[PDB]
């Protein structure tokens, strides 16, 4: 999915 | 409106009416700085031992597939004393208690959401959890309780698998992995029936957990209880708290904790709050 990111 | 008045007041009353049944809780760091646990995201919050290419690479799932060594030596070093809940996670434990609770979303590790009496039914855990590890070999996946992990983690023994002596991995989410299908499965469902929005100790500048705010019903009252306001729109690139058009949106800044306690008062569950955390934290001390 769109990927965990600050 | 649904709130008569953009206070904390006016969300007390919304949640005593017959018009509030279900409740989704939004929490970050913010719940379990008051507990010791450091917001592992902030910069502002002991690497160069490492040879990193870039401090945030300890977080990053591309390095930890190269090297994992750094990761659990740092594990070491920020493994909490105790684990023990705050006063914003026994809030809500009376939330479930009290029949109001339909999820919370954390962005925390910390276990600290299952310790206060949270069930996994009632939690998207969307950065996962130290709760269970798992063997990363495909074919074996054995899972480890954390008391397991934490023995690996101090014995500075790098934790194998007892089957296949593969890598044990901690069920977090580092950055640049999907999220689990849970969040996705659980958000289409629990945003088409929630009445309410308490977002908790987060600053709401981590994708895509951010995103849960622009899910709510459009009538869903927003109640943020943070040390600073956040998520507002970006006037570069939202909670409306403070233009004439705002109509739902309400902003408590404070510490988590005294923004719950402030909340319960209102609510007439001060002694049941105050009761439930002496109980639990003198359980925990006394472990
Ligand atoms: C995505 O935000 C996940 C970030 C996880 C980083 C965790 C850092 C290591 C935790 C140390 C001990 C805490 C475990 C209880
Ligand atoms: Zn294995």
């Known amino acids: ?6 | 409106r649904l709130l008569d008045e953009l206070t904390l007041e006016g969300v007390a009353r919304y949640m005593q009416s017959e018009r509030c049944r279900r409740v989704i809780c939004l929490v970050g760091a913010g719940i379990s700085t008051s507990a010791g646990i450091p917001d592992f995201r902030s910069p502002s919050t002991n690497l160069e031992k490492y040879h990193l290419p870039y401090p945030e690479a300890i977080f990053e799932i591309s390095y930890f597939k190269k090297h994992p060594e750094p990761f659990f030596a740092l594990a070491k070093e920020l493994y909490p004393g105790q684990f023990k809940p705050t006063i914003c996670h026994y809030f809500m434990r009376l939330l479930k208690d009290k029949g109001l609770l339909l999820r919370c979303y954390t962005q925390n590790i910390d276990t600290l959401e299952r310790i206060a009496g949270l069930e996994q039914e009632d939690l998207v855990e969307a950065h996962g959890t130290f709760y269970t590890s798992h063997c990363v070999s495909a074919s074996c996946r054995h899972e480890y309780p954390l008391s397991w992990m934490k023995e690996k983690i101090f014995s500075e023994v790098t934790p194998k698998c007892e089957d296949c002596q593969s890598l044990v991995k901690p069920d977090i989410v580092f950055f640049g992995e999907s999220l689990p299908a849970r969040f996705f499965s659980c958000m289409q469902s629990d945003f088409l029936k929630v009445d309410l929005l308490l977002v908790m100790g987060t600053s709401l500048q981590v994708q895509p957990f951010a995103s849960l705010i622009s899910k709510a019903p459009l009538s869903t009252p927003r109640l943020l209880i943070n040390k600073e306001k956040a998520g507002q729109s970006d006037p570069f690139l939202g909670m409306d708290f403070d233009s004439k058009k705002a109509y739902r949106d309400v902003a408590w800044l404070g510490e988590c904790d005294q923004g719950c306690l402030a909340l319960a008062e209102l609510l007439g569950w001060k002694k049941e709050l105050e009761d439930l955390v002496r109980r639990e934290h003198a359980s925990i001390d006394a472990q």
């Open chain 1, 1 to 6: 999915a769109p990927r965990k990111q600050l």
